[PDB]
Each structure stands twice: as structure tokens, then as C-alpha cells.
Amino acid sequence: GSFNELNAINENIRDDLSALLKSDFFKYFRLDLYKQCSFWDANDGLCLNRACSVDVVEDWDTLPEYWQPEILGSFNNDTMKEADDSDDECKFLDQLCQTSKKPVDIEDTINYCDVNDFNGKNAVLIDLTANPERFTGYGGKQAGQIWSTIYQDNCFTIGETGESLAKDAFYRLVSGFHASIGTHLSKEYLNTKTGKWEPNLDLFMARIGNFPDRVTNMYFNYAVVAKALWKIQPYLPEFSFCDLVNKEIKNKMDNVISQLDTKIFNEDLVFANDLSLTLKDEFRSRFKNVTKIMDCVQCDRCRLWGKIQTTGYATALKILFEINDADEFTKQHIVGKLTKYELIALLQTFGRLSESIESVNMFEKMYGKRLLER
């Protein structure tokens, strides 16, 4: 029954959210090309023995050279650009249009990236519109080990208030995230017979359709992210007005968020009121580690989007935990302190979840039509 309300909300914002995500302000994301995987060599030592590929398509050996996993998951050249230490993504929403640099800086220098701890040994700005999440063929042992490690590190301090609650929330968030990716690779699948990317109903049923709970987890994630966006809206500063190109972005983000109001928000989705300060920080800490293990993903596009969504979820949790027991002054502070980096992650993550719900609707129709066919 809650699918009805959430999906209704999503039908109305779907197109407005899409256009926003395509704007100059939100279309790029800062990514460090240098991987720090605490296990195997992520950078060089490319994945051998297909320990990073999926059997799926009968056999890749019978498919053309340019349709292998390493290519389907690679970045587009003519899109990304070098990221400087002045990258707006490192700045706080408060520093974006601070009344003609109210914070002086008419001399010396100010490295916001280095300050806010963006120690990327080699960061670049990727065009998310030209590098969409899609089926890349990535999978196998590495993919499975990464997912397992993530799910297996669901261990909070015993003796705490809601240790069971935190454990359930963490699992659902990861599951919705995992499912979200499964829905996208099913929606954006490469038909090795026409070279066209098209919906693959059979894959979807296998990764999602026949496991209703994965669908439920995506709606849960959608509500969590939507609630975090709803919670910050009243404290968003005028972060875009001073920029000619993105002048209306702040207002256009308001158009979307305002259409999200639902009674579902009255619910304590991540148990903010039931988790001790110790679990809240442990919970947050687990997600940063998820964001870290993303460096072990060999597939580049998968890593980019993984970094985006995990960061998106970490931001949502930060918002919902902190804004919970906070006065108005603290709320403006909390929202004003989010980085552009974090806001892009949060909104882009909401975009992935919005498209996933839409894709489920779409696949359910394909399913219904194929059955009416036979």
C-alpha cells in the first residue's frame, strides 16, 4: 500500500528530477582515479581469469571484441576534465555564493578541497550524463566477494539500545542499493544481436522480479533519501543564484522536493529516535567503509556509481540522524555544511532510485504483455 503512495510521488517528479540531474550544477561528480583497495591491486594488475566477469551471455568468446566487460564498463574520454583544488564540489553549500566572497580571500589562497579532506591523489570531474549506470558485464568472484564483505560487516556493538534495529536498517539500505543496480543493468542491457541497449525482462525477473523483497528495499531506500531531501529543504541556502548558468537550480530543486511530502515521513525510517549515539556513529562509520571498498571494484562505471550511491546513503543518514534532535540554528548549520559533493551524491542517488521504481513499473508491463501474448 505504501508502494502506491511512493510511486505516485515518483510519477509526478520523475521528469522534473531528470532535468535537474542533467543541469550543469548536478551533472558532474568528483572521482579519484587512484584506487586504494585494501585487498588486491585495484589500479593496475587488471582482473585476470574473468574473476570480475559474468557468465550471463552464454559466452563472450563468441561475441565481438568491443563488447567485453572491460569495455562496457569503461569511461568515455571526451567527457571528463581535470579537477582543480578550487573544485566547487569541495565547498560547503554556504561557501558557494557567500555574498561576493564574504569570506575575504582577495589574496593568499584557499584550498577548500584539501581542507574538507578531499585528498584525492588524482581527481577528475566526470560527466554523469555521458557515463550512465548500465549493464557492464562485471560480476564473478570479485563482485560476489565485494557484496558479501559488505553484507557480512553488518555487526554493531552488542548491549546497545537498537543493535538489532541498526542491523536491519543497514541490511535494507545495502539490499535496496544492490537491487537498484540489478534493476539498472536489466533495464540498460546490451542485445549482442543488434548492438542496441534495451530492456531485458528475463534478466530483471532473475535479479528482481522473482524476489519481491528486493523491490521493497528499493522503496525503503527511496523513502529514506526522499525524507532526507525533505528534511533539508527549509534550510537550503541560496547556493546557485550568483551563478548565471545555475541561477535557478536552487529553486528548481525546491520544485521537486516540495512534491515529496508524504505521511510516510512521520515514520522513523532509520530509527533515529531509537539508536544510541554509539550506534549512530557506528552505522555512519560502516557506510564510509562501504564507500571505501568501492575502490576494489575493477569496473570503472560501476565504481563511479557505487561511490555516488554509497556517498548518497551516507549523506542521507547524516541528515536524518543529526537533524533529528536539533534546534533550528543547528538545522541551518547542518544543511549549510553539506558539501556540493554530498548534495550531488544525495540527489543523483535519489535519481537512481527514481529510475529504478520507474523501471519496475515498466518491467511489470512487459511481463504482463508477454503473458497476454501466450
Ligand SMILES: Cc1cc2nc3c(=O)[nH]c(=O)nc-3n(C[C@H](O)[C@H](O)[C@H](O)COP(=O)(O)OP(=O)(O)OC[C@H]3O[C@@H](n4cnc5c(N)ncnc54)[C@H](O)[C@@H]3O)c2cc1C
Ligand atoms: C558496488 C558494486 C557496483 C556494481 N555495479 C554494476 C553495474 O553498474 N552494472 C553491471 O552490469 N554490474 C554491476 N555490478 C555487479 C552486479 O551487482 C552483480 O554482482 C553482477 O551482475 C553479477 O550477478 P550475480 O548474479 O553473480 O550476483 P548478484 O546478483 O550480485 O548476487 C549476489 C548474491 O546476493 C544476492 N543478492 C542479489 N541482489 C540482492 C539484493 N538486492 N538483496 C539481497 N541480496 C541480493 C543473490 O542471491 C546472490 O547470492 C556491481 C557490483 C558492486 C559490488
Ligand SMILES: *[C@H]1CC(=O)N(CC)C1=O
Ligand atoms: C561481524 C562481527 C563479528 O565478529 N562477526 C563474526 C565473524 C561478524 O559476523
